[PDB]
From a paper:
In Escherichia coli, the 14-cistron phn operon encoding carbon-phosphorus lyase allows for utilisation of phosphorus from a wide range of stable phosphonate compounds containing a C-P bond. The crystal structure of a core enzyme complex, Phn(GHIJ)2, revealed a symmetrical hetero-octamer consisting of a compact, central tetramer of the PhnI and PhnG subunits each interacting individually with the more distal PhnJ and PhnH subunits. Here, we show using single-particle cryogenic electron microscopy that PhnJ mediates binding of a double dimer of the ATP-binding cassette proteins, PhnK and PhnL, to the core complex. ATP hydrolysis induces drastic structural remodelling leading to opening of the core complex and reconfiguration of a metal-binding and putative active site located at the interface between the PhnI and PhnJ subunits.
Inspection of the active site reveals clear density for both ATP and Mg2+ suggesting that this is a pre-hydrolytic ATP-bound state. In the other structure (open, 2.6 Å, 31.280 particles, C1 symmetry), one of the two PhnK subunits has moved away from the closed position by 25 Å while the other has stayed in place. Due to this flexibility, PhnL could not be modelled in the open state, but inspection of the 2D classes confirms that it is present and possibly in a closed, ATP-like conformation.
Numbering used by the authors:
A (entry chain E): 3 to 146
B (entry chain J): 3 to 250
C (entry chain H): 3 to 278
D (entry chain G): 1 to 353
E (entry chain F): 2 to 194
F (entry chain C): 1 to 213
G (entry chain C): 285 to 353
Write the structure that this text describes.
């Protein structure tokens, strides 16, 4: 069932900020010899939407998507797909994807890299939700 | 052996409409006419035999090769170099934006004539053959009358000297005198050449004047093979008698 | 390489697809090979099919010569040359002699095309018989059926309607003896130049997205009649600059009252003659 | 049509230099960066992203800067830049039920499960010019409330569970892609929506306004407006499982339109749909209204307004085509006009000797 | 498990395409693809370069049994993202060695009357393409005539000399050996001489 | 029993606070000035001036800044501000023949008196994004030529004196003012022109493109 | 340029021309040309309309209860 965990940490990497991810990865002081089998390339991802939110598919434009791939010494392949055009960010995400598949870095990086990034993103999301919910319109309230 | 053999050709796109269990043999130099009501499906049979409509079941042999077993290119070439088709409406078989000479010489150019002078001379000769004046060769079919347009279509079909010509009632919509003169010209052309003619008509007069052998189709099936001056004057099948009485 | 852009301005997927289509077209001379690229907006009308081919086949070491109606001074030709200088950085020359890629609109250069050269023609319409057949379903099949007599109809009736063959532009040809192709609206004067040319000619239509190529030393013959052989009317007027009348002459307008003059369309050959 | 023109290279280069120097403006002021434009002129970037077709904030802001603030030129720049990019993947269909809401409103009910979340909106502001913006200042502090999002079911789900409207079911039909094949009219609804999302905002706005005033009325109700972040997901070939590549800020408009009386079904409301990048919502509302208007053949209602005309609406909504058409008329047509002069002069002689 | 592709994909692909265009537009000419310095064994440099420059998601590849390999398949699926088939019928860029069976070649798609460009493009690896039976080439792309003596099996020699598929139908042969390549399209008049 | 409570004013005030926070954007960046928008986003300013009805570049730039770049919102801001101000006077009809030409071109005549003048334009440019604009820079030093401007009479003056056109002659009629009274169709050409100058440019561009068909 | 073209199109009545296309329809073009009116009256759908929609709901419920049950 490692697919779900790999999806989780890949999404945490992609949704991260290049500044946050770069700073944390530099702080970790963790690096293993890797080769970029796929150079970080920024192209398009076609946006697919649904009529009425649930109906037939239609095309709703394109977004910028960057992808990179890195092979570690032992042959583990790490991939990345991040919206935008930050190729160094994509390379870092691919490197972390490769590292997280090694038993030496899985738990360590989950405790030190992925979980903290997810927590920071959740914290800022909650703050934004508070600011937004300040704008809610109240009509009725239960009274005992 | 017969030039054209038809065996158990059947096609029913809709219930009743169409034709079924149709078979016959046609030899060179013989004119085979088809007589039936509007719903008899004789038009469907004419379309099917002329490499246009694919039959549901049956076999058509030309010379020694199955008609529909040939490739699309082979049948398309056959429809323009050795077979002729004369639709009821001349505009259907005539290219409106092409002069009479151009329409006549289109077949020759397709064959690879590549000679403007020879093409024009052949077009003028065929216009003279079908009685069309040669002074208006550069004219276009739109300006020609119904009889003249039919004659131009006949010339276009016969420019290649085909050995088999289908005619889906070209006389329809023509006056009695014009129709009679056109039928006389068609008979003269048929006797002069050795090409077979398959005429589909809704009236027995055209078959009597032009056709040599006659067949009767009712509700999409052959009723009784006929012959000139025998079925017309001595109808056997009750439906044939009813048709003769209605015509008279 | 222009910053933020791919080399030759095209994504590598469109390049690869167009390259595959070009190879298929070369293997099938005269056949309009379809390719399923995307829609790309461009300011200048010329380029929907020519700029795509140039971007697909242009390299860093190529020398590019952009030609509009034979001229290199044209605004569109200068714009396209500058565009390819920006997005590829290639060298550009005013001489057909020193060029390795010649992107042209409706004109073959006067100078003979030598080996190791590719000439690209913008094709507004890749199938000449679009003026007759509205539905394309029969158009594709009639090529296999070889029913090329239909396009002979316009040639036959041109003399009837005018007394002479006036189809001096986009005159149809039969290449390799098999495939009827319609080059760009090049003049009748240049149609002979396509016969067994040493260079590789590429034709690209964008609004239809069809590519066809003429391999070097390929037999292409003008479509005509034996009684009316394909002939090019000799020019009896000279060029106002160099004088020589051995090259196709275009018209340049000098005033607002209609005054004009004739000058060699291929400005490169015109300069070669003038400097002589 | 196409008049070949020679001898303007020096003048054209000088004109471009003048244009760039005017775009830079007075050099005493700082140079308007792209991050500033995307952060502080966010609605212009929303429109340019939606119409150009690339949901990249920085690229749209750069195109706006290059065009000196012109939205049509910026849209042209972004649309052209879209050609140099490789299509790396196609996302999973967006699930707007998972949208992280910055704003959500419904005009069909007083209150709904989830609440009327106004969010950031210029609505209800008094449009009195704020001259304090002529100098620097400080943005207001944001009052905070419960940092939670309540279940915000789509209002159309509520209407459909009552039988008053129909769920939009997925038939599995492959969406049409105008960015690969030019539209052929009549075009399926997916092609119509794709073209509407790329149409000029100020023209679809006017078409929707015309429908409102009675030129093809569809009795619209803002059934729901949502603005928020939606996760984008792809299924790479290298892997086999869906990965999440990021989130896009988008606005979705679901219109409740007039009800119909099907021959063998209970009467129910119709519905338009709009979907745009960013928080520019009037474009989404106009998209929904014109979508409902162009659904006329689906409902078998004969067009009575220009907005119900598919060819008229869709053949001219593209900014790039109309801008190129208008720009061509500027090009030197000295020869073509000389032809017209001769044609006109003959008419003058024939009708006046 | 993965093989490195072009060092510089864009320029290397462009150069390989220009060399292949020179080979194809002038059948019989020998061109060298210096870009890739190591093929995907058993594939040689020419075959790998051709696949890298032309193959993608829209071009299924049919590697033959002697050439089909797990590492080759993985590298091809990764760098080019092209679908991999196992039967020649659905192929678009077939790859085979001199051991190509007659049935395999006959199964390769040749095109169609309405879509003559829809057929496969056979790629053939040979021990050498200079030493063998003499062969004269003429037709489109040939100035006067070219002499080539490549080591072909009898099946493809019969196909070339006695093409049973009428023009425009037919596959486009690509001889490969190390870096060097040669192209024989369907329109080349090839005779034993 | 769900007693009704008041949350409307506190809703809209919070919504407007969020909107202004969004307008200011990230605070680590300097707040773009009205002068910068006027000098560098000059085409947006031109559109807002034309459609809002006030030829005041600073006001249009302020409207753009306050509207978060939303051109329609800035247009409406300027239009609402129009009501604030009083009509001090009415200018004499503009004389476009005395223009100090930044740009002057014609697509009908090559040799127009005064000479063709491309001026600052985006025409003939390649629609290639200038990624060097992602960072600071400066435009090239401007080339210079003769500093004198020749008289530039209208092209349609030439067309009228040649009998090919009709000279537009003022009859002394009083122009219609839609800002004073509501439109009453059918409208005089003055009313139509006044309305068109206020019309949305995308809508009018689409209508002009449709007239091609 | 767009203003000039639309002005010429709207000059139809004084040239004795027939409106062939919306662009030459004076009332349709002018009534919706104003940006402020169109933007305001399209954005006003964001205003609450539950009183009007309730009237629609009641009728549709009555129609549903009679069409079927
Ligand atoms: Zn000269
Ligand atoms: Zn023009
Ligand atoms: Zn309302």
């Amino acid at each position: 069932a490692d697919t779900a965990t790999r999806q989780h940490w890949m999404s945490v990497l992609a949704h991260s900020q290049p500044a946050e991810l770069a700073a944390r990865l530099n702080a970790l002081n963790i690096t293993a010899d890797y080769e970029v089998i796929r150079a970080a390339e920024t192209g398009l991802v076609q946006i697919q939407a649904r009529m009425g939110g649930t109906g037939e598919r239609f095309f709703a434009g394109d977004a910028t998507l960057t992808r990179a791939a890195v092979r570690l010494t032992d042959g583990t392949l790490g991939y990345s797909w991040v919206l935008g055009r930050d190729k160094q960010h994509a390379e870092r995400c691919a490197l972390i994807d490769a590292l997280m598949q090694q038993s030496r870095h899985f738990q360590n990086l989950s405790e030190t890299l992925i979980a903290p990034l997810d927590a920071d993103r959740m914290a800022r999301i909650a703050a934004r939700q508070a600011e937004v919910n300040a704008s809610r319109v109240d009509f009725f309230t239960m009274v005992r | 052996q017969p030039l054209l053999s038809v065996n158990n050709l059947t096609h029913l796109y809709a219930p009743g409409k169409g034709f079924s269990d149709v078979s016959f043999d046609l030899w060179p130099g013989e004119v085979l006419g088809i007589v039936g009501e509007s719903g008899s499906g004789k038009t469907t049979l004419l379309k099917s035999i002329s490499a246009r409509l694919t039959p549901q079941q049956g076999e058509i042999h030309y010379e020694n090769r199955s008609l529909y077993a040939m490739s699309e290119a082979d049948r398309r070439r056959l429809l323009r170099t050795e077979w002729g088709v004369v639709h009821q409406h001349p505009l259907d078989g005539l290219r409106r934006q092409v002069s009479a000479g151009g329409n006549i010489g289109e077949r020759l150019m397709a064959t690879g004539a590549r000679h403007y002078g020879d093409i024009r001379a052949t077009a003028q000769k065929w216009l003279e053959e079908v009685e069309i004046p040669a002074n208006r060769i550069d004219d276009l079919p739109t300006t020609f009358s119904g009889g003249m347009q039919q004659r131009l279509q006949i010339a276009r079909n016969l420019v290649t000297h085909p050995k088999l010509v289908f005619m889906d009632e070209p006389t329809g919509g023509l006056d009695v005198s014009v129709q009679a003169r056109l039928l006389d010209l068609l008979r003269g052309l048929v006797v002069e050449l050795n090409l077979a003619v398959v005429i589909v008509t809704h009236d027995l007069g055209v078959a009597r004047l032009l056709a040599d052998r006659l067949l009767v189709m009712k509700q999409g099936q052959v009723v009784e093979s006929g012959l000139t001056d025998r079925v017309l004057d001595d109808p056997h099948h009750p439906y044939t008698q009813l048709l003769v009485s209605s015509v008279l | 390489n222009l910053s933020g852009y791919n080399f030759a301005y095209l994504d590598e997927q469109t390049k690869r697809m167009i390259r595959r289509a070009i190879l298929k077209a070369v293997a099938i001379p005269g056949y309009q090979v379809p390719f399923g690229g995307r829609e790309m907006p461009m300011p200048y009308g010329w380029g929907t099919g020519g700029i795509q081919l140039t971007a697909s086949v242009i390299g860093e070491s190529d020398v590019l010569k952009v030609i509009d109606q034979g001229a290199d001074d044209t605004t569109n030709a200068v714009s396209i040359r500058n565009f390819f200088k920006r997005v590829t950085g290639v060298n550009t020359t005013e001489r057909t002699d020193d060029a390795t890629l010649i992107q042209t609109r409706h004109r073959i250069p006067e100078t003979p095309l030598t080996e190791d050269q590719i000439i690209i023609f913008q094709v507004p319409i890749p199938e000449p018989l679009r003026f007759i057949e509205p539905r394309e379903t029969e158009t594709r099949t009639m090529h296999a059926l070889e029913e090329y007599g239909v396009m002979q109809v316009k040639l036959y009736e041109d003399i009837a309607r005018f007394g002479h063959i006036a189809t001096t532009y986009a005159y149809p040809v039969k290449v390799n003896g098999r495939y009827v192709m319609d080059p760009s609206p090049i003049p009748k004067f240049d149609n002979p130049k396509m016969d067994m040319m040493p260079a590789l000619q590429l034709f690209g239509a964008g609004r239809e997205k069809r590519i066809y190529a003429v391999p070097p030393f390929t037999r292409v013959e003008s479509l005509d009649f034996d009684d009316h052989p394909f002939t090019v009317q000799q020019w009896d007027e000279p060029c106002a600059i160099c004088g020589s009348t051995h090259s196709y002459l275009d018209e340049v307008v000098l005033d607002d009252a209609g005054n004009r003059m004739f000058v060699c369309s291929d400005t490169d050959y015109c300069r070669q003659q003038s400097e002589a | 049509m196409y008049v070949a023109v020679k001898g303007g290279e020096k003048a054209i280069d000088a004109a471009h230099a003048l244009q760039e120097s005017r775009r830079r403006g007075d050099t005493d002021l700082p140079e308007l960066s792209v991050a500033q434009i995307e952060q502080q002129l966010n609605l212009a970037v929303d429109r340019v992203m939606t119409e150009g077709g690339i949901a990249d904030r920085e690229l749209a802001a750069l195109a706006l800067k290059q065009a000196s603030g012109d939205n049509v030129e910026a849209i042209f720049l972004l649309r052209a830049y879209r050609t140099t990019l490789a299509k790396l993947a196609v996302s999973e269909p967006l699930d707007t039920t998972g949208m992280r809401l910055e704003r959500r409103i419904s005009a069909v009910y007083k209150d709904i499960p989830g609440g009327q979340l106004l969010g950031p909106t210029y609505d209800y502001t008094h449009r009195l010019l704020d001259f304090t913006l002529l100098a620097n200042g400080e943005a207001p502090t944001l009052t905070t409330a419960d940092s939670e999002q309540q279940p915000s079911p789509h209002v159309f789900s509520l209407l459909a569970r009552q039988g008053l409207a129909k769920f939009e079911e997925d038939s599995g039909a492959q969406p049409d892609d105008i960015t690969r094949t030019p539209p052929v009219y009549p075009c399926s609804r997916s092609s119509r929506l794709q073209q509407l999302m790329r149409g000029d905002e100020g023209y679809l706005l006017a078409l929707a306004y015309s429908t409102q005033r009675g030129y093809g009325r569809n009795h619209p109700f803002a059934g729901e407006i949502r603005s928020g972040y939606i996760d984008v997901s792809i299924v790479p070939e290298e892997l086999g499982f869906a990965v999440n590549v990021g989130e896009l800020l988008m606005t979705e408009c679901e219109m409740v339109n007039g009800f119909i009386d099907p021959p063998d079904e209970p009467p129910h409301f119709t519905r338009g749909y709009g979907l745009v990048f960013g928080m520019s919502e009037r474009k989404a509302m106009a998209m929904a209204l014109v979508d409902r208007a162009l659904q006329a053949p689906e409902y078998g209602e004969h067009a009575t307004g220009p907005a119900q005309d598919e060819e008229f609406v869709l053949a001219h909504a593209d900014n790039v085509e109309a801008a190129g058409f208008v720009s061509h008329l500027k090009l030197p047509h000295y020869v073509d006009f000389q032809a017209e002069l001769e044609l006109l002069k003959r008419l003058q002689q024939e009708k006046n000797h | 498990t993965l093989e490195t592709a072009f060092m510089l994909p864009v320029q290397d692909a462009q150069h390989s395409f220009r060399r292949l265009l020179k080979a194809m537009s002038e059948p019989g000419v020998i061109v060298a693809l210096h870009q890739l310095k190591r093929g995907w064994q058993p594939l040689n440099i020419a075959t790998t370069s051709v696949l890298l420059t032309l193959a993608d998601n829209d071009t299924p590849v049919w590697l033959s049994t002697p050439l089909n390999n797990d590492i080759v398949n993985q590298s091809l699926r990764f760098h080019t993202n092209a679908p991999l088939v196992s039967q020649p019928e659905q192929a678009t860029f077939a790859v085979t060695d001199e051991a190509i069976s007659s049935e395999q070649l006959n199964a390769l798609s040749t095109g169609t009357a309405v879509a003559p460009e829809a057929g496969a493009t056979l790629i053939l690896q040979v021990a050498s393409l200079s030493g063998g039976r003499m062969l004269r080439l003429t037709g489109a792309g040939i100035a006067e005539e070219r002499m080539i003596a490549p080591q072909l099996p009898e099946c493809i020699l019969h196909e070339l000399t006695e093409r049973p598929h009428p023009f425009p139908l037919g596959i486009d042969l690509i001889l490969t050996c190390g870096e060097r390549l040669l192209a024989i399209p369907r329109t080349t008049h090839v005779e034993v001489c």
